[PDB]
């Protein structure tokens, strides 16, 4: 009996309390306010040095949280590396979607560097100078460091504290190999006719109609780890080819990740920075269920590069309402739905695949 | 949606929006939609050979007790000589093969007012429509209806305080998912409903941590409300599938198999992994075979001091009833013969 909480209603001014399990929507707070505590300054420095001595030149980021962690750590890490006489410099760029997967893993050094600090927020005083050898974190550096020499998914979250004025995150370096997404920050719940699969960057909702189905999703990233089966509801009798969000894109292997008449969206607009999956027509558009439509393929935006909308769309076997994506660039359609009258070469498409 | 919570172990508090699952193991108000529809359904079932009802859970039994007087008032007002008798609940609630019908028309006379202001009691009639009790000889199990109601309220909402039920149109086998809530967060998970609260934890592997049951249902836990349903055998679940135990890896423990012959006759158990007061259990491969669950005290109150298991795992599986502290099927006494102890007379 440690997790006690209350819930409030703002239209009736009443409150119910009790004990149980509480799952919070933390997706919309992709915030830099957090303060990050990787393994240790000396320990992280020794691990990165051993990785450089092993022939690993860089890192692919699992999610935005690791990218922000590297940005917050890089300066002090460089300073402590210089204070130990190691000619190496860490350069951190931005993330690009989808976040592809690397085959290497960081090592766990037997001993750390015996010169430097003991805490991450302690002190970063003297800035380091650029060095010949650069250990580059993700960015537009695929030429000087290919993906095959680039590590991925090397950190293990230990504690997610919630203080009065700030919230802090504690990390370590994994002893053993892993393919799954970190389970310490995953929360799944179902009650009645509604369910949620969620973590720090995903918030996926389901509903019970005649059949359980996907209702809407809100993604602020497209990671490529595997959703653990222990944090998934109804993981049997489901084919990987039916999941709306592909299994390669960290979509849960669940009956809650389906929709009747649609198949896996391997060719959706996965290049965006943030998208939301909705089941309705795009603004000023309309779709027909007629057999004589075209074969499914890459997803198409509803507005031409000139800014003109299209008012004719068809699908062969889809079910109303249609599957539509929502990025800042516009309102894409699903792979099933194709233009009815206009040629498809006049429209912009998705050049990525899962 | 909006709420706040406290964590006493980590000493932190927080607020926000999300999804909350509470421990409900009364706060809510359970009565059927229409008394006249229920009266018509009962009469039509009686005319077609169906004589009794076996409750799925305690909630249905409480609802029947609340509604029986008004139901008899409607039955007597309409010229029908039928009596509804409601008795106590004996665990486990066994499953009946019949179902209540849906009447095409309701009774011509009566009132749909939830509560009956008129306390005019009807005269006892020689025809009895018994609800669950010690009445297995007036109405045997083969003529009893079971799981005939649909809880027609759902959702993540938590401020309603009023639950409505109606007779369903389609046959069903599963526990009603309107009152089921399961949740996992980090290293702790729960499978729960109005009567079950089953907890699992993340050790080197996921396993059963502790359970707290206040009834013994025999419906089937829905697969849509279960975590990690694949790659699991039915012979490994600690709580058997026949007793509405979820078919999941969270319902397992290393070195143990399904407890088909545990003390399910009791009225409230508490499964946990530790010794009974003043007892120790050893690990010797020469111990006995799996069999019925035995208490730690004899019929006179004498506490046994020596138990063995062949291939179990410390700490030992034990049940905490109100009148004893039993063990699992794999733990047997080292010295005392078993023919004088008390063992469970029920099987799943």
């Amino acid at each position, epitope marked *: 009996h440690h997790h006690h909480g209350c819930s409030v209603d703002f239209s009736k001014k009443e409150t119910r309390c009790g004990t149980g399990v509480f799952v919070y929507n933390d997706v919309e707070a992709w915030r830099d306010r957090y303060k990050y505590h990787p393994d240790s300054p000396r320990r992280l420095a020794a691990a990165v040095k051993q990785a450089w001595e092993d022939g690993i030149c860089g890192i692919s980021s699992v999610s935005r949280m690791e990218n922000i962690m590297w940005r917050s750590v890089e300066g002090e890490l460089n300073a402590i590396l210089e204070e130990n006489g190691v000619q190496l410099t860490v350069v951190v760029g931005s993330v690009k979607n989808p976040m592809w997967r690397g085959p290497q893993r960081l090592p766990v050094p037997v001993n750390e560097l015996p010169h430097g600090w003991k805490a991450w927020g302690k002190s970063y005083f003297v800035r380091a100078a650029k060095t010949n050898n650069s250990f580059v974190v993700d960015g537009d550096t695929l030429k000087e460091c290919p993906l095959k020499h680039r590590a991925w998914n090397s950190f293990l979250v230990e504690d997610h504290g919630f203080g009065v004025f700030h919230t802090s995150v504690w990390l370590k370096v994994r002893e053993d190999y892993s393919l799954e997404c970190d389970p310490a920050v995953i929360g799944t719940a179902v009650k009645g006719k509604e369910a949620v699969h969620s973590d720090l960057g995903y918030w996926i909702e389901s509903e019970k109609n005649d*059949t359980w189905r996907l209702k809407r999703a809100h993604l602020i990233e497209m990671k490529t780890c595997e959703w653990p089966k222990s944090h998934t509801l109804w993981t049997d*009798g489901i084919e990987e080819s039916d999941l709306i969000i592909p299994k390669s894109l960290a979509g849960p292997l669940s*009956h809650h990740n389906t929709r009747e008449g649609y198949r896996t969206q391997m060719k959706g607009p996965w290049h965006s920075e943030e998208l939301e999956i909705r089941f309705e027509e795009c603004p000023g558009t309309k779709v027909h269920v007629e057999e004589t439509c075209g074969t499914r393929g890459p997803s198409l935006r509803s507005t031409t590069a000139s800014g003109r909308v299209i008012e004719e769309w068809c699908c062969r076997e889809c079910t109303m309402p249609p599957l539509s994506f929502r990025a800042k660039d516009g309102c894409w359609y699903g792979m099933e739905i194709r233009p009815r009258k206009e040629p498809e070469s006049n429209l912009v498409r998705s050049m990525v695949t899962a | 949606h909006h709420g706040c919570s406290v964590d006493f172990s980590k000493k932190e508090t927080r607020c926000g929006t999300g999804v909350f699952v509470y421990n409900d193991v009364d706060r809510y108000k359970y009565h059927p939609d229409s008394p006249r529809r229920l009266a018509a359904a009962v009469k039509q079932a009686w005319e077609d050979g169906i004589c009794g009802i076996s409750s799925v859970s305690r909630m249905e039994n409480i609802m029947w007790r609340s509604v029986e007087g008004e139901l008899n008032a409607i039955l007597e007002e309409n010229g029908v000589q039928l009596t509804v008798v409601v008795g106590s609940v004996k665990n486990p609630m066994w499953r009946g093969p019949q179902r209540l019908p849906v009447p095409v028309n309701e009774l011509p006379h009566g009132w749909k007012a939830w509560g009956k202001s008129y306390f005019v009691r009807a005269a006892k009639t020689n025809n009895s429509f018994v609800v669950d009790g010690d009445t297995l000889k007036e109405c045997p*199990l*083969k*003529h009893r209806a079971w799981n005939s109601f649909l809880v027609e309220d759902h959702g993540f909402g938590v401020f309603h305080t009023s639950v409505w039920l109606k007779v369903r149109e389609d*046959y069903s086998l599963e526990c009603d998912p309107a009152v089921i809530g399961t949740a996992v967060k980090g290293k702790e998970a729960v499978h729960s409903d109005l009567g079950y609260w089953i907890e699992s934890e993340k050790n080197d592997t996921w396993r059963l941590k502790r359970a707290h049951l206040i009834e013994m249902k025999t419906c089937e836990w829905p697969k*849509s409300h279960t975590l990690w349903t694949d790659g699991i055998e039915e012979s490994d679940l600690i709580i058997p599938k026949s007793l509405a135990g979820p078919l999941s890896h969270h319902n397992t423990r290393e070195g143990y198999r399904t407890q088909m012959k545990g003390p399910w006759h009791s009225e409230e158990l508490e499964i946990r992994f530790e010794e009974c007061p003043g007892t120790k259990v050893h690990v010797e491969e020469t111990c006995g075979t799996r069999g019925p669950s035995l208490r730690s005290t004899t019929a006179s109150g004498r506490v046994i001091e020596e138990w063995c298991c062949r291939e179990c795992t410390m700490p030992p599986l034990s049940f905490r009833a109100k009148d004893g502290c039993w063990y699992g099927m794999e733990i047997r006494p080292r010295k005392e013969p078993e023919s004088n102890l008390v063992r469970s007379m029920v099987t799943a």
Partner: antibody
Framework: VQLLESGGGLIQPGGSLRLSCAASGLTVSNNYMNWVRQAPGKGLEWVSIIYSSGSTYYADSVKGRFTISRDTRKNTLYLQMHSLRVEDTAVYYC?????????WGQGTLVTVSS | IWMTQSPSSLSASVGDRVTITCRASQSVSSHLNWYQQKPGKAPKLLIYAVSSLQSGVPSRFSGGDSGTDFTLTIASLQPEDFATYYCQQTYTIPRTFGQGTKVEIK
């Protein structure tokens, strides 16, 4: 009501077949539906079941090869069959279950040989 | 739950009483059904819930027994009542049938 099976015929070993059961008088989304087979000159055998909630179960003989399914719009059952063996030759029925099988189909014939 | 049905075959003339016996290796609550199948035709449900009779089935059929055993009884062996009979349990997955009992004209 009336249920009618389809898709039966002749297939060589290792081939794939897909049966259908068209339902009239009842909708399949609110019913428990079974598939039952009977090898020529032998007794009845249970194959698979789908609940009204969508849960599926299979026999140990066909597990990993057969897949029961349904479609809401067309109101029909399906039974996808893969890696067919010689011992899969029988007559296949679809049925409705409410505690008992009270509505059977006519049956369809599946033969596996060369 | 395995179901053993005896006798394997039966022969008797018109007007006699014949009883078919089914056994279950475990406990079934009351979920036992009796079916009748004729050559070339789909099976037909006769008795359900141990004793409950199905509509349209004549009154010559009745089932039910005490203990771990179940029986199906024929009142008057009409000459259109020669077929194979099976017992089924609908209590546990997997569903199981009996091997069948053939009733032939004597």
């Amino acid at each position: 009501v009336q249920l009618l099976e389809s898709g039966g015929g002749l297939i060589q070993p290792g081939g794939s077949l897909r049966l259908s059961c068209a339902a009239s008088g009842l909708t399949v989304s609110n019913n428990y539906m079974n598939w039952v087979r009977q090898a020529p000159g032998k007794g009845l055998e249970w194959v698979s079941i789908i609940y009204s909630s969508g849960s599926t179960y299979y026999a140990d003989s066909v597990k990993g090869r057969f897949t029961i399914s349904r479609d809401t719009r067309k109101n029909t059952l399906y039974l996808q069959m893969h890696s067919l063996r010689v011992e899969d030759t029988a007559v296949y029925y679809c049925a409705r279950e409410r505690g008992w099988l009270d509505y059977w189909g006519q049956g369809t014939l599946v033969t596996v040989s060369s | 739950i395995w179901m053993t049905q005896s006798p394997s075959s039966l022969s008797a003339s018109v007007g006699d009483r014949v009883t078919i016996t089914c056994r279950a290796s475990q406990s079934v609550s009351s979920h036992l059904n009796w079916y009748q199948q004729k050559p070339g035709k789909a099976p037909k449900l006769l008795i359900y819930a141990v004793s409950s009779l199905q509509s349209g089935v004549p009154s010559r059929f009745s089932g039910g027994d005490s203990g771990t055993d179940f029986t199906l009884t024929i009142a008057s062996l009409q000459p259109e009542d020669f077929a194979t009979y099976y017992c089924q349990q609908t209590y546990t997955i997997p569903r199981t049938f009996g091997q069948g009992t053939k009733v032939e004209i004597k």
